[PDB]
């Protein structure tokens, strides 16, 4: 709850709305640059080191047996610890396309202040989901086994009913739940009667047996559902079992950022309350055994640049730190076009 301005280096143009901040042993890695990889960083990943309120962007190379991936502007990342690695699905190709390939990003070597990734791809079989962005995927454990839970977001129109004047028009995907097994790349869709319409730009929180869906925006009605979801899942030896329940206590928030403050206790930051005005209130979620309670913070004061702007973005840095970005105001005509701040969660 303490605002702090951060100065940027020379390669500031590589930051675009919808980046990715991965965490490995406390070290933060920036992914999802702007444009295409140049001659300096042929991969696209950087060390997001910050010293004396000044961030640097040192490139990171891949392994000899790795696979180079294009940057994504709205991917779906989940912390899969089963060593430590991440799983990226979805995204948006810089050529305004949607990829539906799973990228397994892991650290294979780290010595002499140099890291080395072993990014590989994995295909999907069975009930494969259509390419989409804005979705969120999590991993749940049951009976000692792990399984990936993914809730769809939005995507382009189907190729059959796609025209020229709506070549870029998108729509919310079908409200289905997909279970992806990373051991064999097997995907299985599940239909739930309580799901009414699609949802995009929501918050996904799970504690080892149930994924919580908070906030989000629906394009079909151009509103934000104020009802949270409780998806109790279980993986028996035979056929899987998934159940969903509706509970009061939702928050009309969209494009919010989620991070961890303490054990089984997270915090929601300001996203977008309405389509026109700016959201400033923030809430905190505290988990226990099966119940869940939400609460607010002590209204941390912001600067004049944040209150006078209209849009922003950002993500979390893993160790209870929110790194957000404010676009430069064209009225001043003397700015780097992207201001950046940090919040000490504590």
């Amino acid at each position: 709850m303490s605002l702090q301005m951060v100065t940027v280096g020379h390669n500031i143009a590589l930051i675009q709305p919808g980046f990715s901040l991965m965490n490995f042993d406390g070290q933060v890695f920036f992914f999802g640059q702007k444009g295409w990889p140049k001659r300096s960083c042929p991969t696209g990943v950087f060390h997001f080191d910050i010293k004396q309120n000044h961030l640097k962007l040192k490139p990171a190379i891949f392994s000899k047996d790795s696979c180079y991936l294009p940057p994504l502007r709205y991917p779906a990342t989940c912390s899969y610890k089963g060593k430590h690695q991440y799983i990226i699905h979805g995204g948006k190709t810089p050529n305004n396309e949607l990829s539906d390939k799973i990228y397994i990003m892991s650290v294979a070597c780290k010595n002499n202040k140099k890291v080395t990734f072993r990014c590989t791809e994995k295909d999907l079989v069975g009930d494969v989901p259509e390419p989409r962005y804005g979705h969120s995927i999590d991993v749940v454990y049951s009976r000692g086994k792990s399984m990936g839970v993914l809730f769809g977001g939005r995507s382009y129109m189907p190729s059959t009913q796609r025209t020229t004047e709506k070549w870029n028009s998108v729509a919310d995907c079908l409200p289905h739940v997909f279970l992806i097994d990373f051991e064999f790349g097997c995907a299985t869709s599940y239909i739930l009667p309580e799901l009414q319409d699609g949802l995009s730009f929501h918050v996904s929180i799970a504690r080892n047996d149930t994924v919580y869906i908070l906030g989000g925006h629906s394009l079909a009605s151009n509103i934000r559902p104020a009802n949270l979801y409780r998806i109790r899942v279980d993986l028996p030896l035979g056929t899987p079992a998934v159940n969903c329940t509706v509970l009061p206590g939702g928050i009309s928030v969209s494009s919010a950022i989620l991070t961890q403050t303490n054990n089984d206790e997270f915090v929601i930051v300001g996203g977008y309350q309405l389509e026109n005005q700016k959201r400033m209130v923030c809430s905190l979620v505290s988990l226990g055994d099966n119940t869940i309670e939400i609460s607010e913070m002590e209204t941390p004061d912001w600067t004049s640049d944040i209150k006078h702007s209209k849009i922003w973005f950002g993500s979390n840095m893993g160790n209870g730190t929110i790194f957000l970005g404010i676009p430069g105001d064209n009225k001043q005509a003397m700015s780097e076009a992207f201001y950046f701040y940090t919040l000490r969660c504590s």
Binding site: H217, L219, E275
Partner: peptide, 16 residues
């Protein structure tokens, strides 16, 4: 004459 964006996604929760 038509809009060159061809059904853009200018919503606030999208890439500006």
């Amino acid at each position: 004459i038509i809009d060159g964006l061809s059904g853009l996604a200018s919503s606030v929760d999208e890439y500006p």
